[PDB]
Design a protein around this ligand. Sequence first.
Ligand SMILES: *Cc1c(COP(=O)(O)O)cnc(C)c1O
Ligand SMILES: *Cc1c(COP(=O)(O)O)cnc(C)c1O
Ligand code: NA
Ligand code: NA
Lengths: 390, 390, 254, 254
Amino acid sequence: TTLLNPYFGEFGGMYVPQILMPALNQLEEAFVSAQKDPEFQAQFADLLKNYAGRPTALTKCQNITAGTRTTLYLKREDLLHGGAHKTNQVLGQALLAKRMGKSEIIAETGAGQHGVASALASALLGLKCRIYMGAKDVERQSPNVFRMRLMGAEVIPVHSGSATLKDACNEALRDWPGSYETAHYMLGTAAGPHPYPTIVREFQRMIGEETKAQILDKEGRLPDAVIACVGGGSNAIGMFADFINDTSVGLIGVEPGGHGIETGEHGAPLKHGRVGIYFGMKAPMMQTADGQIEESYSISAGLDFPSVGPQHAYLNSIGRADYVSITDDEALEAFKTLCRHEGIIPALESSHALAHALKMMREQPEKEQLLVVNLSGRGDKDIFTVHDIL
Amino acid sequence: TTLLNPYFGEFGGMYVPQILMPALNQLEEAFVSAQKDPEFQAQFADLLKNYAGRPTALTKCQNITAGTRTTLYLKREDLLHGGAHKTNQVLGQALLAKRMGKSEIIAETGAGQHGVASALASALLGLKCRIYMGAKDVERQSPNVFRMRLMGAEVIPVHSGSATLKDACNEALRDWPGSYETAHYMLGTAAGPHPYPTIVREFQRMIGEETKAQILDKEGRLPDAVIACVGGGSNAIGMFADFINDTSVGLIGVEPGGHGIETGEHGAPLKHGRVGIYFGMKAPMMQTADGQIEESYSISAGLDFPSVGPQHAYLNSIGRADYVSITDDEALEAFKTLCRHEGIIPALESSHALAHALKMMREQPEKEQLLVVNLSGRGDKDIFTVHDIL
Amino acid sequence: MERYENLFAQLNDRREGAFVPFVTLGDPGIEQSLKIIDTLIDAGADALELGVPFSDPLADGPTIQNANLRAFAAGVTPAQCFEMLALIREKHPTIPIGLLMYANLVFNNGIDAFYARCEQVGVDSVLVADVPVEESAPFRQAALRHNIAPIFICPPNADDDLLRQVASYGRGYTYLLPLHHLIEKLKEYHAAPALQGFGISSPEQVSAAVRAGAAGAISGSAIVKIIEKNLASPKQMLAELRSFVSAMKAASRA
Amino acid sequence: MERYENLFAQLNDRREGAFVPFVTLGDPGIEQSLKIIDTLIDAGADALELGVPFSDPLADGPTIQNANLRAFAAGVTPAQCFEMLALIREKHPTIPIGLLMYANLVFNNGIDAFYARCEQVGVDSVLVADVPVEESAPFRQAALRHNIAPIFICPPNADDDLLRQVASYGRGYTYLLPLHHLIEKLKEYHAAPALQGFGISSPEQVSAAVRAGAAGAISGSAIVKIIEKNLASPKQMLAELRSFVSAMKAASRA
Ligand SMILES: *Cc1c(COP(=O)(O)O)cnc(C)c1O
Ligand SMILES: *Cc1c(COP(=O)(O)O)cnc(C)c1O
Ligand code: NA
Ligand code: NA
C-alpha cells in the first residue's frame, strides 16, 4: 500500500529488502503531510531565501551567442550556498527528518558535493550526520572530505566492491534498517526507491518555477528548450518539472558521453544502457551482459551515478523529453568558452549542458531559438583538472 | 582643482607624479558624471542583480549565539558571484572605464581575489585586462593565477622590491602614465589617490544599504554595531557608509593582529603604524623607523595591503568608528566555529570580523546586543591552510 | 517445492528440526566450493541455501560481501553457478536446494527465463533479497509456473497484514528473521513452515528455535566465516566445516 | 638655490648648456659611490641630481629600481646618505647638488626637519617625485624657508595653467620631461631655467636640447646603466663613466 504512486510508467518501484519498507512508508507519509503543512512550507522557504540565497539569478549570455540568432540564459544555481543546486533538497529532507523526530542523517557521496551539502544542512539544523564515501573516492576528493569534517560530519570510507559511489549507496542501505527509528537516509539524487524520486523532484522544483517567472519577465514568453545535465537526474528534473505541462517547451537532458559512446567508457545509461533493478528501483543501469552493475565514466566526477532517475526514463519513453550525450572534450571546450567570454567558471557537470546548447547554436546559427541552460554548480573545484589536461 | 574633496580631515590627497594627474582628474570627472546619469545607474544595477546575484542574503546565526543575549546576523557577500564582495566595485569601475571610452584594464593583486574579480568583469564587458602580481604571490596563489588566465587576463609577475602586493601596486602606477588614453587602472581597495577611496566606497555602499533595509525588516530597528575586517578598507567602508549618519550604530573595523601586536608581525597600521605618504595618499602605513614601507603579516593573505584607506583613518580620528585587532589563532577559531555550527565556511579575512563579534558576545554574555558581521567572502580557498595548521 | 514438503514431513516423523547452511557458490573457487558443499551434505545439512555472486549485495553483511569478493577473484559468473547447481543435483536427488538471489540477476534476461533455468537444473526455491512482498507478483508467479517455491522474509516486527501476505505468498519455508507470537501467527495463517535465520551460530540456537515452534534453523553466515578463516588449508577448512555442521545438526534432534 | 643662479649665469657667459648626471647615493656601495661621484664631477658634470634609496620607487623605471636594490644590498639608509652629502659638499663648495626624493622620506620625521637637514649639509634643491604641484605647498614652503630650491617636472602635454604654476612655484631649474613651445612658455612666465630630462643618453641630445632653447640636459638613467654593466670592475666602471660624461659635456659647449 502507498499513498502516491511509486512508478513512472514501468520505471521506479520499491525494490528494497522487506525490513526497509517501514522506513520508506513512514517517509512517504511524513512527506505527504509536510507538503500540505503551511508552517513547513514557510520554514523551507525561509531557509532557502535567508540561508541558501534564493532566488538565484537567470543571467543572459550575450557574448557567447553573438553573430547567431540563439539567445541563451543560464539559471544560476552556481550562486547557491555550497556552490551547486544539491543544497535546495538537503535543506528540505533535513526539515522532513526533524518533522519525523529523527536526530541523525545518513548520506552517500561520490565526488563529495552531496556529502558537503548534507553536512552543511545537518550542521545548521542540529543533526548528527554520517556520510558513506567509497574509499577510491575519499582518496581523490580530499578538499570535499575535509569540508565535511570541518562541518562536523562523520566520513566513513567504504572498501567493498569497487570502493566508489555504488558501493557507498549499498552501505547506506545496510545501515538504515538498523537505525531508521532515529536516522533519516538523505539520498542525494532523484533516484533510488520510492518515495525518493518524488521527494527530491519536489524539493528541487523551485529551479524551474523561478526560471519560468524570470524568463516571462525578461522575454515575455517561455523558452524554446531548457537544457540540463543528467548524472542521477535531480537538477534536471528540478528545472523540467514546472515546464512538463507547457508542451511547447523542449526538455533536454544531457548524459556524459566520456571518451565517446562507441568506446564504451561513458555514463549514459538512459540512452545506452539496459533496464535493470538495483538501488531500490527498475531503471536503465550501467551493467555487464550477465547483470553485474558497473561504474559510469566521465571527466566530471559528479556525473558518476551508474543509473538514472526513473521519471527521466519515463519522460524519454513517451517522448516528452529528449536525451543526448556530450563527451569529455565537448565539456572541456564549453567550460573554457564560458570562463573566457562570460566570466563564469562552471562546474564540469554543468559544462555538459552548456556544450549541448553551444552545439544547438553553432550547427544552425540562423535558427531563432531562446534556450535556458541550468548552471547547476560552480567550477572552482575543477580548475586543476582542467589545468593538468590542457 | 578638483570637483570633490580629496581629503578626509588630514588623510588622503593625490600624491602621485605630475604626469598621472590628468588620469585622476579625468576619472573624477567621469565618475561625477556617471553618478548623476540614470542610464549608468540602471546598467550598474542590472549587472549586480542579474550577473552578480544581488541582493545578497542577511542570515541570522542562532546556533552560535545560543545561551547569550547576542543576536548576530551575517551579511552574505560570500554568496556574490566570485565569492567575495570585490565583484561589486569591479563591475562599477569597468562600466566607468567603458564610459570614458577605454578598452583596456590594469589591476594589481596580492592573494589574487581582486585579480580574479577584475578578470571576470573584463571578460563580461569586452575589456582586455592585464594584472600585476608580485612574483612571491604568484608562486603561492596558483589556483587564482590560473582562474585569471582561464578568464583571459594577462598575468605579469613583478620581481622588484619585495615581489609582493606593494610592489605590484608600484608597477600599476608605472604603467598607467603611458597608457591612460586607452586603459583604466582598476584599483582594488578604498585607498590610493583620490578619487579611488570615494569611488570604491560608492561602488560598495549597497552592502550597507541592503543590510539596513534587511535588518529593519527582520528586527524593526537598526543594529547595535556592524563589524567588518579592514585589509585596505573596501568591504568595511561599503558596510559602514549608509550607517554613518545613524549615530546609534557602532562601526567597528578589525585589522589583522597576526602573531600578536606585541610581536610586531601583524597588519594593523591604522592603530599600530604611523602616518606616511605612499601609494598616492597620506594615511597610516606599515613602515620602518626611517620611512621605508613594509609588508603587513596575517595568516589571511587578503588582509596584506600595508596601509588602510584614508576615510578609516578619518572616522577613527573623530571617534565615529572604532578599530581593533584579532590574531591568527582568534581568526582560525572563529572559522572553525562557523563551519561546525552554521554550515558556512567563511574566508579567513571575514573570520577576523566574526572573531571580534564572538568576543563581544562571550565576554559579556548577558549584554543584549544586535550585531551584523559583513561576511565578505567564502572560505573554500582557505581549507588547506586551515588543514595543514591544525 | 515437493522436496521441501517431503523433507519437513520426514523431519516431523522424527520429531526433528531442519539445519540449513548458507554458502556462496564458488567461494573460494568452483572446485573447492563443490567439495565444501558435498561436505555440508555428508555432515548432515537437511537443505542448502546458496548465493550467486552479485557486484552490489546491499542486503548482506561484511562476511558475505567478502565471500562474493573471493568468488569474483576466481572468475565466478551466474552461468558457472547454474552448471555448479546441475552437478549438485545430479549427485544428491532429494536434498532441497534454495537460491539467494539479487533482483537484477533474476530480471536480467527475463524473469520467466530465470525460473525456467532453476526448474531445469533442479533448484527447489528462490529468495530474492531486494524484492519485498509489495513488489513480488511477477517473481512469485513465475516461480510458481516452474514448480519453484518463492521464499519471503518475515521480518521481526512484521505487522499482521504482512503476516498474512507472507503466509499467503510464500511456499517451501518462511525465512523468519516475540518469536513465539510471530511463529503462532504464521501457523494460524497456514504459512510455509518457519526457519529461524540470522545469528544461528551454535548448537543451542538450533535447539531453541525448534523449541519456540520453528521447523528448523538457517546459519546465514557462520559457515562462511569458517571458509574465510581457513583459506590457507583446504583440507583443514573441510574438517572444521564437518565438525561445525555435525554439531548443529545434532542439536535439531529430539 | 644661489649656486644654481651662479652656475647658469656662468654657463650663459660661455654660451654653454649644463650637463647634469643622475645617480643613486650608495650604488653599488658607499665608498664606490663617493668615487663615482668625484669622477662625474672631474669629468665635467655641471651639477648632480642624487637619489636616496627608497623601498617603493613608483615613478622609476627598471634601471633605477635595480640601483636601489644594489644600494639596499649594501645597507644604505637616508642617514648614511646625509653623511655622504656632507662629504661631497665639503670637497666641492660650488657645484649645485639636487636630491630626488620620494615623499615619505621627506615627510617621515617632519617636512621642515628634512629641509633643514638638506640646508645643514649643503644641498641646493629637492625634487619630490610623487608630489604634484597641487599637493606641494608645505614642501615648497619649507624648501624655501631653508634656502632650498623646490624643483617641479613640467610634463610634455603641460596645459597652460600647469605652465604657469610650475613657473611660479619652482626655483633652481624646471625639470622638463612641441618642445620649442613648452620652452618659450616657461620663459614667458619667467620660470627657472629648463633642463631637458629623460632619454638624454648621447651627445647629440645635449646639443639639441640647448639648441631648442633649454639651459641644459639631465641624464636620468644612462650613468646608472654604466654602473650596472661594470659591476665586476670598479676601475673599468670609473673609466667608462669618465668617457661618457666627458662627451656629454663636450656636446653642451658652443
Ligand atoms: C551532483 C551534481 C550534478 C549531478 O546530480 P544530478 O542529480 O543529476 O543533478 C550536477 N551538477 C552539479 C554541480 C553536481 O554537484
Ligand atoms: C580582499 C578581501 C578583503 C580585504 O580588502 P578590503 O578592501 O579591506 O575589503 C576582505 N575579505 C575578502 C573575502 C577579500 O577578498
Ligand atoms: Na547516470
Ligand atoms: Na591594511
